[PDB]
Design a protein around this ligand. Structure first.
Ligand SMILES: [Mn+2]
Ligand SMILES: [Mn+2]
Lengths: 204, 204
């Protein structure tokens, strides 16, 4: 019941910041694998009809033998699905999103630093996120394919994510090798703040 | 305290199974970073002089605030140090190690399938290991830089590792990209079974 989404842009649209080969393998190999394995785990359950963002808020009610596979693979599908949409071909937010950033973090610059720190500090595989929690913004990180929508019990953090960065080594190894900070610096050039703004509006 | 060990062979000695560029980055960048961060954590403590494989067996004795840094960083140093030594330039074990493999797994071919399965199913970053536990061989995996020497409470598995394979994406992405199974198949060509036999003798 899940399918791989098409990207909103061509595989080379984000060069030189994110290389075309990475975009192609990340989408057509990594993300495809999560969709396929999530579908396998959903076979013959009552959950095969739920949108993926709703399924991952309900992991405590799936059968115990399928919890891990669904956490990992539905999590992977939800996470990559959002990631493609929040990127696009002095890039900064505006309007009420900028105001909420100023309020929570002091400035856009201070926000970038907190976000990069969270991404750099995540040991092994995972993601860093900007989330809305009780109408306020915060920066959290998760392991592997965990997503703050899963809740504190599972993911260790909570909130509705409106922006995320993938720091699995597959997201940056071909262009940046070990240099995660360089990848994070380039990432700011490709964030679609219009899309993040839309997500913020719908999260409060 | 700790220092980065010299490799027992040139960076290009394992071609074409593992590429020279990866060997260089894996050693001088990734492994160096674990050494540096472990040294920072161990400064001016009674623990700074212990061999690393002894330290990771005693993580319960260290100050509570240093446990996390040492698990990740002394773990990474211990893991990579062993990794370089168990590779060298069809390849299979002999003698009493081969007999032990036959006894525990049925055959060397059956052991390879079990080891590859453990390494394939480790989600995210980690390692797969052949361990000796109560005189018998078994195959286990660990997350991130955990090592079975840390014990079941920390690593979730136990035993003395005699062979391990790194399945962090940095270990294989440049040459294999998403194809972790092709990397594992290549890895059999570079195992130094004489060294593994040595470790088996010491651990039994
Ligand atoms: Mn990814
Ligand atoms: Mn490694």
């Amino acid at each position: 019941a899940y399918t791989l989404p098409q990207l909103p842009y061509a595989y080379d649209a984000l060069e030189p910041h994110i290389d075309a080969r990475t975009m192609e393998i990340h989408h057509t190999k990594h993300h495809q694998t999560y969709v396929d394995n999530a579908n396998k785990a959903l076979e013959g359950t009552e959950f095969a009809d739920l949108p993926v963002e709703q399924l991952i808020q309900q992991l405590d009610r799936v059968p115990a033998d399928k919890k891990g596979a669904l956490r990992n693979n539905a999590g992977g599908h939800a996470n990559h699905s959002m990631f493609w949409q929040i990127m696009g071909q002095a890039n900064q937010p505006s309007g009420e999103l900028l105001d909420a950033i100023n309020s929570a973090f002091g400035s856009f610059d201070a926000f970038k630093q907190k976000f990069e720190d969270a991404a750099k500090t995540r040991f092994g595989s995972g993601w860093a996120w900007l989330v809305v929690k009780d109408g306020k913004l915060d920066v959290v990180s998760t392991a592997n394919q965990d997503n703050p929508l899963m809740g504190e019990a599972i993911a260790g953090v909570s909130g509705t994510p409106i922006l995320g960065v993938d720091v699995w080594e597959h997201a940056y190894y071909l262009n940046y090798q070990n240099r995660r900070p360089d990848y994070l610096a380039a990432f700011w050039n490709v964030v679609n703040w219009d899309e993040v703004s839309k997500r913020y509006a719908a999260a409060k």
